[PDB]
Ligand binder design. Structure first.
Ligand code: CL
Ligand code: NA
Ligand code: RU
Ligand code: RU
Ligand code: RU
Length: 129
């Protein structure tokens, strides 16, 4: 599924992300935009052989199992494919674990480089929430 901006903001809010670990809703929407262009089916292979999955580009090195990242972990205890669903529940619950892990949203490089410090509330501007 390719979510609309407001559609995603609403879904993220329903799933508990608004101010999770102190991150306003617009931070989450901005990160999804630059990670996946709001496409739940987004995948990207990293040069270390790991792969990033779904709307928040969650990496198989640490977070999910894809059976093809030797030496990896599966800290969210899910198949990586779960992260590509139209239902964002798996992505959201995994993202909670990630952002709780010590470096906050800096875990998402595209957040640090494109969202951090910016007017992130613009991402939720005009949405019914
Ligand atoms: Cl933090
Ligand atoms: Na893994
Ligand atoms: Ru939902
Ligand atoms: Ru950890
Ligand atoms: Ru870790």
């Amino acid at each position: 599924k390719v979510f609309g901006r407001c559609e995603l903001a609403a879904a993220m809010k329903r799933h508990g992300l608004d101010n999770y670990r102190g991150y306003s809703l617009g931070n989450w929407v901005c990160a999804a935009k630059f990670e996946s262009n709001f496409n739940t089916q987004a995948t990207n292979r990293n040069t270390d052989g790991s792969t990033d999955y779904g709307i928040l580009q969650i990496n198989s090195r640490w977070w999910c199992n894809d059976g093809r990242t030797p030496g990896s972990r599966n800290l969210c205890n899910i198949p990586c494919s779960a992260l590509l669903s139209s239902d964002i529940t798996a992505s959201v619950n995994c993202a909670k674990k990630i952002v709780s892990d010590g470096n906050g949203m800096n875990a998402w490089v595209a957040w640090r480089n494109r969202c951090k410090g910016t007017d992130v509330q613009a991402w939720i501007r005009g949405c019914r929430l």
